[PDB]
Amino acid sequence: RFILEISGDLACFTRSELKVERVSYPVITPAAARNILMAILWKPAIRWKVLKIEILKPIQWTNIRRNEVGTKMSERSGSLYIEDNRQQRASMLLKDVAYRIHADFDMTSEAGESDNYVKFAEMFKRRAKKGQYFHQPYLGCREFPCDFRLLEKAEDGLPLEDITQDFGFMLYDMDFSKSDPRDSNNAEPMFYQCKAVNGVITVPP
C-alpha cells in the first residue's frame, strides 16, 4: 500500500444537484483521489484503488462570487464577446484543508511488456520523492494547487478522530465500461459515506 498527505488553502468538490451555484462537499471525493494519484503518474495499464481517507483539520467555509460565461465555444463561431453572456456565479469554498490517503493499485487487462509491479511501485516512490507529475493535481478546480508529501505514518498534525456528522449518500466514481476509449458515455456509481469516526473507508463493489 501507500500513504500520502495532501495540503492546500482552498478546495471545492461540487455536488451535482447544485452544480449551477457551487455547493462544495464537506469531505473529499473518493473519485477525486483516483485522479489525484493518476496526476502524478499516468500509464494506460494501471488501475488505482483508494482504501482509507483521513481528515486532518476541522471543516471551515467561506463564500465567493465571480463573473462567468455559460456558452460552450463552437467551431462555427468566431469569438464570444463575453459582455453579452455574463452569468454571475457563487461558490462555497472549503478553507485550509490537508488530507491523508491510504491507497494501492492493480493491473488492467492490457498489461503490456514492462508489466512489472515492482518497477511501477519504485518509479512511483521516485516521483513522489522528487516531485514529478504530468501536472499539478487540483483540489476540485485548477486554481487550487495542492502539495503532497510522501510519508510513512503519523508525520503531520494528529488526525481529528472526533466523531463527526453523517452525510448520507455520496458520489463514488463514474463508470468507464459502456464507453470505448475516450469515455464516450458514462453512468454514476454512488456509495454511502456513513460518517466514519475519523477514517472514511472506501468499500469496493
Partner RNA sequence: AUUGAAACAGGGUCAGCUUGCCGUAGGUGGCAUCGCCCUCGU
User: Which residues of this chain interact with RNA, rule CB under 7 A?
Assistant: 13-14, 16, 19, 22, 29, 31-32, 35-36, 39, 44, 66-70, 72-73, 82-83, 86, 88-89, 137-143, 171, 173-174, 176, 181-183, 188
Closest contact distance (angstroms) between CB of 138 and RNA is 3
Q: How many residues does the chain have?
A: 205
- Residue closer to RNA (CB basis): 65 or 155: 65
With both helix axes pointing from N to C terminus, report the angle between 30-40 and 117-130 in degrees, rounded to the nearest 10: 90
153 close to 65: Cβ distance less than 8 angstroms: no
- Residue closer to RNA (CB basis): 131 or 161: 131
Cα dihedral 166→167→169→174 (10° resolution): -130
Q: Residue 49: beta bridge partners?
A: 104
190 close to 172: Cβ distance less than 8 angstroms: yes
- Residue closer to RNA (CB basis): 72 or 153: 72
What is the rounded CA–CA span in Å between residue 191 and residue 18? 19
Closest contact distance (angstroms) between CB of 50 and RNA is 12
6 close to 76: Cβ distance less than 8 angstroms: no
Closest contact distance (angstroms) between CB of 54 and RNA is 17
- Residue closer to RNA (CB basis): 86 or 161: 86
Closest contact distance (angstroms) between CB of 88 and RNA is 7
**Element of type H or E holding 83:** none
Closest contact distance (angstroms) between CB of 163 and RNA is 27
49 close to 106: Cβ distance less than 8 angstroms: yes
- Residue closer to RNA (CB basis): 162 or 168: 168
